[PDB]
Amino acid sequence: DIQMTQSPSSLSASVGDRVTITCRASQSIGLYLAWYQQKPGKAPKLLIYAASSLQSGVPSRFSGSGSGTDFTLTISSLQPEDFATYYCQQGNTLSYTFGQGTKVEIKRTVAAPSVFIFPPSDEQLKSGTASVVCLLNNFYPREAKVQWKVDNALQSGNSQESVTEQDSKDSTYSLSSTLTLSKADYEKHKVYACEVTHQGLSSPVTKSFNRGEC
Amino acid sequence: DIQMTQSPASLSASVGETVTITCRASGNIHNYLAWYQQKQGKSPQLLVYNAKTLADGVPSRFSGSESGTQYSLKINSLQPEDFGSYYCQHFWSTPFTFGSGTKLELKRGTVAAPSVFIFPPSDEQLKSGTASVVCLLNNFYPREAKVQWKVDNALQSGNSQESVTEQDSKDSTYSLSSTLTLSKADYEKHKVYACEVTHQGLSSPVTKSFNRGEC
Amino acid sequence: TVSHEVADCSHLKLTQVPDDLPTNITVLNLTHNQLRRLPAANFTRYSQLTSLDVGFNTISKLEPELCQKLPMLKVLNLQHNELSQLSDKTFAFCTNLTELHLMSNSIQKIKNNPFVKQKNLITLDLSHNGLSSTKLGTQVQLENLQELLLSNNKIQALKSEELDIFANSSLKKLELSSNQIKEFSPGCFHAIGRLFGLFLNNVQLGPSLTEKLCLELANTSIRNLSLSNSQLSTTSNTTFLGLKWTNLTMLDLSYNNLNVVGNDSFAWLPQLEYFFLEYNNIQHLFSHSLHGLFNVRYLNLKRSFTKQSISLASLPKIDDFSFQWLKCLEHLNMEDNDIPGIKSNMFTGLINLKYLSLSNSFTSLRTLTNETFVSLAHSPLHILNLTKNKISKIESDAFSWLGHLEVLDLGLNEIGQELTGQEWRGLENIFEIYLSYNKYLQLTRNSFALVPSLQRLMLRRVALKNVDSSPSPFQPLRNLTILDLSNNNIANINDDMLEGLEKLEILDLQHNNLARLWKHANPGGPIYFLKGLSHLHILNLESNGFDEIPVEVFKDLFELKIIDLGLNNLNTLPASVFNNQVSLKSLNLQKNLITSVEKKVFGPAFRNLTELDMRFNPFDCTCESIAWFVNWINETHTNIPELSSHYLCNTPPHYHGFP
Amino acid sequence: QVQLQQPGAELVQPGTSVRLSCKASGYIFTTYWIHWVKQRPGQGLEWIGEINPNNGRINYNEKFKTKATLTVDKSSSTAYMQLSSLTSEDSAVYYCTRVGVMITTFPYWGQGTLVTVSAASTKGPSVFPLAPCSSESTAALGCLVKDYFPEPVTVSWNSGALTSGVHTFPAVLQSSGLYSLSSVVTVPSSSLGTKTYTCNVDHKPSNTKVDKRVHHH
Amino acid sequence: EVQLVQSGAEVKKPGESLKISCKGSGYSFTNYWVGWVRQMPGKGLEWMGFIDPSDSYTNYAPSFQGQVTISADKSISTAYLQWSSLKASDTAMYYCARELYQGYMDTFDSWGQGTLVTVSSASTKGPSVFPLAPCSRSTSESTAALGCLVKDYFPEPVTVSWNSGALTSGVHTFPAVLQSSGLYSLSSVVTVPSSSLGTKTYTCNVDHKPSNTKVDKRVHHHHHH
Amino acid sequence: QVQLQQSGPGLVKPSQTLSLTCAISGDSVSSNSAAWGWIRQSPGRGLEWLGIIQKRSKWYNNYAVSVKSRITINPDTSKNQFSLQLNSVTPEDTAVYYCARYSYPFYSIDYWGQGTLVTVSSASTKGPSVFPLAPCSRSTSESTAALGCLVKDYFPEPVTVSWNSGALTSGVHTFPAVLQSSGLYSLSSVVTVPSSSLGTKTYTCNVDHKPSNTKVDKRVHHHH
Amino acid sequence: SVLTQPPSVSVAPGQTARISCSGDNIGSYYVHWYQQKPGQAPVLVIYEDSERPSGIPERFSGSNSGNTATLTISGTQAEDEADYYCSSYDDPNFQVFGGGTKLTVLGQPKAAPSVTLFPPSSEELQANKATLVCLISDFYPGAVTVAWKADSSPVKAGVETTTPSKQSNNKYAASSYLSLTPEQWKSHRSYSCQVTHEGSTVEKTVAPTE
Ligand SMILES: *[C@@H]1O[C@H](CO)[C@@H](O[C@@H]2O[C@H](CO)[C@@H](O[C@@H]3O[C@H](CO)[C@@H](O)[C@H](O)[C@@H]3O)[C@H](O)[C@H]2NC(C)=O)[C@H](O)[C@H]1NC(C)=O
Ligand SMILES: *[C@@H]1O[C@H](CO)[C@@H](O)[C@H](O)[C@H]1NC(C)=O
Ligand SMILES: *[C@@H]1O[C@H](CO)[C@@H](O)[C@H](O)[C@H]1NC(C)=O
Ligand SMILES: *[C@@H]1O[C@H](CO)[C@@H](O)[C@H](O)[C@H]1NC(C)=O
């Protein structure tokens, strides 16, 4: 019944910096703690065992310290491929338990999004259902306030937003918001607008199109 | 189920000799062994446990050795009171198997001739319509003794039964009881009753006899 | 600003001495302040003081009159100050002193006789200064002095005419550590009346100069010698030659980076009793290396041998019979080394060895055969420490040679095997067996049959296989008093597991999966494994995910003193579950999901409690749930730690966060 | 001083069931488990099983798993074993044993109970005196126990007084199905008419107890 | 190399039996313990339990106690993880790892690639690809964006390419979002300056492996509808 | 009590060796709580420190920078004394020498020697000329009459004058010597005695001159 | 450290006499004061700047502070007039003295010069030489002017005279010697020794005729 709590939950760091991740245990687990690295979608990897011991094949920049209830993972010089999700585990009890993990992200400045709104194609309307697609391209940070507006009225419940991971180049996010409405409800109205409120804009940008006029 | 193959089954040893009884395990039972001595008509007594350890009170002449799956009970300098049956046992895995057993007999005690007696049937048994004459061989050695009944110089067949006691602890002497059972008619059919004993302890086959109505 | 009859005014940034302190104080502590001076007048009020500590200040000089104001002063501490100049008046009137601390005062030189009237002084400390000479007077004074500390100075040489001033003195300790000394004048040690302990730690010497030192210590009264971190690379039979004419009993050669120990190095020490050789770089321990050390009783070899070079394959070699000379050796500390393995005749000769610590002494002692500890056949070993040795297998009859062994520590290893019982053969004096933190242990019925005299058994986090056997593996352990089975995550346990352990007092069962055994829906009914434990004193059942407790589980635990049910999912307890616990003194139920505390359950329990621990609980704050509990709390004498801070109510939301 | 006591012998009908008792004395019955052992005359032994006096846990031998049924009376401190489906192959001696401080030992044994599966109806023994017709230095007295069923019978001499020089022979089985035993004692002639000689025969199944004094001396 | 290989992803209905495999190679399989770890999409790593391949000794975490069965075949050197009755909450990724006892604690050096078990009430269905293009005159900034919408398909995954793999950078294939109905929805876009109208041909190629459906779709906006 | 008895030659020629000796009684030379040494006072009231010796383990001695490598103070436990040796003496080394006992802890001198006078002159040490002194015609009613002795032309100083070999004490006055134009010394020592015992009591004067080894006793005859 | 003492310090009889000893930080050291009368060995009156040796009058007290070490005598008597030296060992120099102070007790009552004139002895005349001895004792102050007269005509040829020095009773003394020939001693009718003290003259006279 040992609860491992790591901190922070997620952090932003530039390449080369020296990073520290903290790991706490509900009760003392001695020196039996292990640091595992996990790449998104890929199988985890054993970085450190016995809290301070370096696993064979693991980079020398990786160090581990601490005892009792307090532990710390330390990366001397951060690498571009060192951005992943780090978990800690206790081995003092046979009922092993992991932490919630620490997500390592790329630190950059604010970047404004490129908004493009796409109307339902005729092939889709031929089926009897419509899905208008709002696209936000390359922005930072991830927090974005996406609000649809059919005939200048706020929508709710029929929008689905998905965000990708950080890009391999500029380290920026892209959001895809899908608004689903039946063809009847689509031909019932005229003005279809997408409003984007971000921190990279002093005033929210609105990309609109009129039903039938497009 | 781990088995226990004990060898031999029969031994004959003089006083002061060294004897060894072997047990073989079908599988590894480690040193977990137990050797018991049992006299006929009693409870098995624990001689050795864990193959090498002596039980409390057990004479120092008893010992045990372990080698592979072979476990050996060794008696140095046999005493006249160390004779009977001997069994072995493992305690490692359920179920517990015992050995077939080794019957130990005393040798020497240089040949002592049997004291032959003969006992006639009582009148109270003659009232029952069944007569029985009992020939006794008191304190003798060795075991091999041939008793033959003679009724008026006629060899009997099948109507006799032998009962031999185990070895005496001190003088190392046996006792044999030959019972002759016949119906009252066949009993009162003749006169001279005799029992003959062929034995190594005797010079000539001693015959002890009596007549009916004499006593 | 506090008073225990000993005034502690430490770390108060006082620029002037307090004048409101009572006249009952005997000890004054003024460490870490901004006192520029110490006028006598300001102490006229305090004529009953016996101890003055004014360390860590900015005091430039002292007034002689001050020493007159404190006639009962025994201890004077003037450490870490600006007191660079001493005079003949400074300490003149303080004739009743016994301790004088003068460390870190940047004293470059002591002039005439500032210590001539300190004939009652016992310990004089002058550490961390710029003294280039051990001369402290122009005459013979300080007769009652026992400890002289001139450590951490610029002293480069010991001369006779600088040291003979203690001719009528009896020194037990001459601290000259952290001094770059390069020359010992002839007869400089004989100039001292009585020298018992010499300390030349952190002093760059070398084999030759050490030999010279031992030569100058010849025919002296020396008893203790410290040469730690003196950079003693190698030793020979000539190095400690002079010590032949000494009755030395303790020698410290630790941290010297000692590479090679030549034959008969310490043959000139037939009186030596305590040998410290920890933390060194010995590559090869020869046979006659420890020749003539038959009186040595304590030997410390912690990290004394070189580490594994991995590539160069440089493992520290120990010749056979390398310990055969230490006939009176009783305590052996060989922990933390890279020794290949235990040779057939490694420990042969130690006929008085009682304690052997082999913790991490070996690179890889993976298998313990019956021939491993054959060299300890004739040793009266009582305590054997085999932790951290990467042991993976203990063969049968391995500890046969250790008949007198009492404490065996086999924890912290890779031990993964089936306990046949043959491991413990020969152990007829065994008291406690540690097995904690290992791979796996497959128990049998005859695992501990050969050691029924075992009293403490530690199986903390070792994975117990077949612990759910019908004849308990613990069955032969009648005298077992302490049993640790924690952190093993055990999911199944038979009721007859603790049967036959009537003398069991302490039971650790925390961090397992025993909840299933205490639910009423358990096939066959709940498992009452605590029946018959009359002499049970301390019970730990934390972290088991317990959510139900059968009413008659603790019915036979009469002598139960402490019970720990914390870190579980407990909520509803049946009535009269603690009714038979009359010897209960400590009850723990922290970090649970308890909402109600009623009299029908906690009644007999709260009777004679001295310690109650129900910290983190989601209490239901209604009358029928908390009335009796609060009523008992307000009037109890039971010590309840963190009662006001960590005892909060959850429901109803009105009392959410309310004590 | 620790003793396990069992009845002498028991006669049973083929196909029925029989309950064997094992009383414990000298120690707390629930401490050590109780084991059972079957042994045929002249043959080897077989470990039936072990039973826990506390909860009633039973470890059986795979051969005796269907033949034997173990039970335990905790109040009377007695271990019981029920043998069902009895054939002639179950006619043997049954011991109950225990372990010691060393659990790999069977230090304590009951005197055992002789189970006979043969029916045939119990019959009592017939005791007759045995004395010569006669002169020498040593005379011999005796008792003959003829026609009884089943084994065994116990023959003492002079209420335990007479001990030395006494040979009681083993039992032999006639073709009639009844066992026949004899006992003798050799004593000096000078004590022929000065001492009393009476043999005490006791048969348990037939509950027959007879005292037969030898005359003709 | 010390290699752990698991079976392919599984898609089943609630209440059905399942049995996934983990085969080890390169090392002595019965020498080291084998542990199982469950990770639900988005959440952290969870400990299920472990097994000793030799004696098939199993030890489960208190939560997974009786909720799963860890088995192992010594012959094939393969540890299996099976459910008698799958549920909706068991929809997760499952890893198996080799336990190495070093530093006096069990650590997992080698892992399996992971088996994704997706359990929901649906059957296999081909995707629907619809072109995404802005209005005719609405585009006159710096760069434009064309896209493809893959909607109403089950189950995952769906591989999206552009111009038979020729078009690489500049694209954005977004994570699929689970609709209320039970069908996934994926968006895939790409940006190009002024070659939008009639300069180059941008045809997205979507491949869906489960339903054996492969669809190519040209992105274009018709002026009349 | 602690007595210090000094001794040595009265005259030491230039470029020769000055020798002196301080004997100790009632105290030991080789003991703690006691240092020793020499201190000279030049004519003209100039008090000057020469040297010290003291025993701790061995005998340690310290000299002044003035005497440099000319002085040598060696103790002798045998005769319980300590000597003084000044090599290569110049005429300005002529002074009144006192041996001193230094008391621990702080070197205050509770015990001095009576002092001895050494002179560097390269002279020949002339012997004294003792003549009696009395009024040529004494016939008075007064109860007092003075008579003395005259020491003429001697070198070098000093000269001890006694009366009745130390018996006569009170009434004795010895006048400070004079440095004649001839360079020689002259001294007179008188005593006042009752006139009633002029012819009934004898008065003799003793004259001791150290460097010349001259001890002359002369009687003053009363003219009747 | 160079110790500096005042050359001379004078005080009235019965008053307080104070002698200073100046040195750089002399307050750090235990000063010692010695007293010395001309013709005698110096005797210690002060040790450890404040302590009086056994046998030393309580009139003598000492202090030591800053740069000054002061010796103090209350109730100054006639016996206290002498030399005073301050001393301290300090460095390996092991003893440092001062310039020396001369304590002067002021004008004691004026005394009349006791003059005694001794004629040449018999043995002296037998040795062909003569010497007249004029001895003066018990007079204050010490300043005197001696003249030798033959009858009434003074003769200064061959006259020796000492410098006045202090006695044990703090009064002064001086000697005078007149070297003559036996013939010139048997020539003049009378020989006279005249002593001039404070203006007043004390004269003695002896004649060859006897
Ligand atoms: C389990 O613990 C019990 C209780 O501590 C141990 O019993 C003790 O064993 C000693 C040594 O055999 C016995 O002492 C006896 O003293 C009597 C009277 O002086 C003497 O006649 C005996 O010869 C024997 O020395 C006694 O049984 C008992 N002593 C105590 C302290 O009560 C027992 O040894 C332990 N079991 C094992 C296997 O170690
Ligand atoms: C001591 O007391 C005086 C007043 O008598 C005060 O002025 C001074 O500050 C005090 N000295 C210190 C610094 O403690
Ligand atoms: C010393 O002073 C304290 C504080 O005023 C007082 O309480 C106490 O009675 C006195 N002496 C003691 C320690 O009894
Ligand atoms: C000598 O040194 C040892 C080092 O262990 C220390 O314990 C002891 O106190 C010292 N002297 C004595 C009193 O034996």
For ligand 1, the distance from its centroid to the CA atom of residue C378, given in whole angstroms, is: 26
How big is the CA angle at C408 (ends C406 and C414), to the nearest 5 degrees? 170
Q: Which chains are within 8 Å of F by 3+ CB pairs?
A: C, G
> Based on the domain organization, do B92 and B114 belong to the same domain?
no
> Based on the domain organization, do B48 and B138 belong to the same domain?
no
Residue E11: exposure state from Cβ atoms within 10 A (0-12, 13-18, ≥19): middle
For residue C55, the 8-state DSSP code is -
Q: Please give the Cα distance from D53 to D73 (Å, whole number).
A: 8
Residue D25 in contact with residue D79, Cβ under 8 Å?
Answer: no
Q: Please give the Cα distance from D52 to D80 (Å, whole number).
A: 12
Q: Please give the Cα distance from G85 to G34 (Å, whole number).
A: 5
> Based on the domain organization, do A112 and A91 belong to the same domain?
no
Nearest CA in chain G to F49: G95
Token pair listed for F127: 């012997």
Rounding to the nearest 10 degrees, give the CA dihedral for residues E26, E29, E34, E38.
50
F113-117 contacts: CB < 8 A, separation 24 or more? Answer: F113/F4, F113/F5, F113/F6, F113/F22, F113/G41, F114/F4, F114/F5, F114/F6, F114/G41, F115/F6, F115/G41, F116/F6, F116/F7, F116/F8, F116/F20, F117/F10, F117/F157, F117/F158
Q: Among B92, B109, B126, which residue terminates a domain? A: B109
Would you call G30 and C112 a contact, using CB atoms and an 8 Å cutoff? Answer: no
Task: Give Cα C386 distance to the centre of its chain.
Answer: 19
Q: Please give the Cα distance from B138 to B141 (Å, whole number).
A: 10
Handedness of CA E221, E223, E224, E225 (dihedral sign): positive
Place of tokens 């016939």: F139
> Based on the domain organization, do B79 and B117 belong to the same domain?
no
Tell me the one-letter amino acid at C649.
C
Helix (H, G, I), strand (E, B) or coil at D18: strand
For residue D38, the 8-state DSSP code is E
Would you call D59 and C452 a contact, using CB atoms and an 8 Å cutoff? Answer: no
- Ramachandran quadrant class, D57 (left: phi over 0; alpha: psi -120 to 50; beta: rest): beta
CA atoms within 13 A on the CB side of C389: 28
Q: Which chains are within 8 Å of G by 3+ CB pairs?
A: C, F
Mutate to test the pocket of ligand 2, among C9, C14, C17 (most ligand atoms within 8 A of CB): C17
Backbone Cα Rg of chain F: 21
Q: How far is C445 from chain B (nearest CA, A)?
A: 8
**Chain F contact probe: residue of C87, C138, C158 with most F CBs at under 10 A:** C138
Q: Please give the Cα distance from G131 to A59 (Å, whole number).
A: 121
Nearest CA in chain E to C418: E55
C54 Cβ closer than 6 Å to some ligand 2 atom: no
The torsion angles phi and psi of C160, rounded to 5 degrees, stand at -70, -45
Choose among E24, E38, E32: nearest CA to E68: E38
Residues with CB under 6 A from ligand 3: C 5, 22, 24
Q: Please give the Cα distance from F45 to C24 (Å, whole number).
A: 58
For residue G108, the 8-state DSSP code is P
Would you call C471 and D55 a contact, using CB atoms and an 8 Å cutoff? Answer: no
**Chain C contact probe: residue of E51, E101, E105 with most C CBs at under 10 A:** E101
CA atoms within 13 A on the CB side of G88: 26
Q: Please give the Cα distance from C314 to C339 (Å, whole number).
A: 11
Q: Please give the Cα distance from E1 to E132 (Å, whole number).
A: 47
Token pair listed for C521: 């829906």
Q: Among B94, B109, B124, which residue terminates a domain? A: B109
Place of tokens 């050590």: D32
Residue B39 in contact with residue B169, Cβ under 8 Å?
Answer: no
C137 Cβ closer than 6 Å to some ligand 4 atom: no
Residues of G with CB under 8 A from a CB of C: 28-30, 89-91
> Based on the domain organization, do B30 and B44 belong to the same domain?
yes
Would you call C139 and F104 a contact, using CB atoms and an 8 Å cutoff? Answer: yes
Q: Give the domains, in start order, of chain G with CATH numbers.
A: 1-107 (2.60.40.10), 108-208 (2.60.40.10)
Tell me the one-letter amino acid at C201.
N
Choose among C376, C309, C388, C310: nearest CA to C342: C376
Token pair listed for C640: 């309840």
From the CB of residue F58, how many other CB atoms can be counted at a distance below 10 Å? 10
C37 Cβ closer than 6 Å to some ligand 2 atom: yes
Residue nearest to atom 10 of ligand 3 (CA): C24
Q: Please give the Cα distance from B23 to B11 (Å, whole number).
A: 15
Q: How far is C113 from chain G (nearest CA, A)?
A: 10
Question: Which ligand 3 atom lies nearest to the CA of residue C24?
Answer: 1
Q: Among B78, B109, B140, which residue terminates a domain? A: B109
> Based on the domain organization, do A115 and A214 belong to the same domain?
yes
Q: Give the domains, in start order, of chain F with CATH numbers.
A: 1-122 (2.60.40.10), 123-221 (2.60.40.10)
For residue B26, the 8-state DSSP code is S
* CA dist list (Å): G8 to A25, G17, G19, G105, G169: 89, 12, 9, 11, 20
Q: Please give the Cα distance from C221 to C190 (Å, whole number).
A: 9
How big is the CA angle at C319 (ends C316 and C323), to the nearest 5 degrees? 110
Residue C520 in contact with residue C496, Cβ under 8 Å?
Answer: no
Residue A129 sits in which domain range?
A: 108-214
Residue G86 in contact with residue G96, Cβ under 8 Å?
Answer: no
Q: Please give the Cα distance from D106 to C28 (Å, whole number).
A: 75
Residue B166 in contact with residue B105, Cβ under 8 Å?
Answer: no
Place of tokens 């004959």: B12
Nearest CA in chain C to G29: C88
Instruction: Write the DSSP string, E158-171.
Output: -EEEEGGGT--TTE
Residue B146 in contact with residue B197, Cβ under 8 Å?
Answer: yes
Nearest CA in chain A to C513: A95
Rounding to the nearest 10 degrees, give the CA dihedral for residues B121, B122, B125, B129.
60
Mutate to test the pocket of ligand 4, among C171, C224, C248, C252 (most ligand atoms within 8 A of CB): C224
Residue F36 in contact with residue F30, Cβ under 8 Å?
Answer: no
What is the number of domains present in chain B? Answer: 2
Residues 6+ apart with CB under 8 A from C411: C387, C434, C435, C436, C437, C438, C458, C460
Q: How was this structure determined?
A: X-ray
CB pairs under 8 A between A and C: 27
Residue F207 in contact with residue F216, Cβ under 8 Å?
Answer: yes
How big is the CA angle at E14 (ends E8 and E15), to the nearest 5 degrees? 105
Q: Please give the Cα distance from F54 to E144 (Å, whole number).
A: 108
**Chain D contact probe: residue of B45, B117, B210 with most D CBs at under 10 A:** B117
Burial B133-147 (b: 16+ CB within 10 A, else e): bbbbbbbbbbeebeb
Residues 6+ apart with CB under 8 A from C185: C157, C158, C159, C160
What is the number of domains present in chain C? Answer: 1
Place of tokens 């003969």: B118
C147 Cβ closer than 6 Å to some ligand 4 atom: no
* CA dist list (Å): E213 to D90, E125, E153, E154, E206: 76, 9, 10, 11, 9
Would you call G122 and F64 a contact, using CB atoms and an 8 Å cutoff? Answer: no
Residue nearest to atom 6 of ligand 2 (CA): C16
Choose among D71, D126, D94: nearest CA to D7: D94
CATH number at residue B155: 2.60.40.10
> Based on the domain organization, do B3 and B90 belong to the same domain?
yes
Q: Which ligand is nearest to the CA of C4?
A: 3
Q: Please give the Cα distance from C14 to C21 (Å, whole number).
A: 14
Residues of D in contact with B164 (CB under 8 A): 169-170
With touching defined as 3 or more inter-chain CB pairs under 8 Å, the answer for chains G and F is yes
Question: Which ligand 1 atom lies nearest to the CA of residue C478?
Answer: 1
Chain F residues 4-63 within an 8 A CB cutoff of chain C: 32, 35, 54, 56-58, 60
* CA dist list (Å): G126 to C658, D44, F131, F150, G130: 137, 160, 11, 15, 10
Q: Please give the Cα distance from C484 to C475 (Å, whole number).
A: 15
Q: How far is G27 from chain C (nearest CA, A)?
A: 9
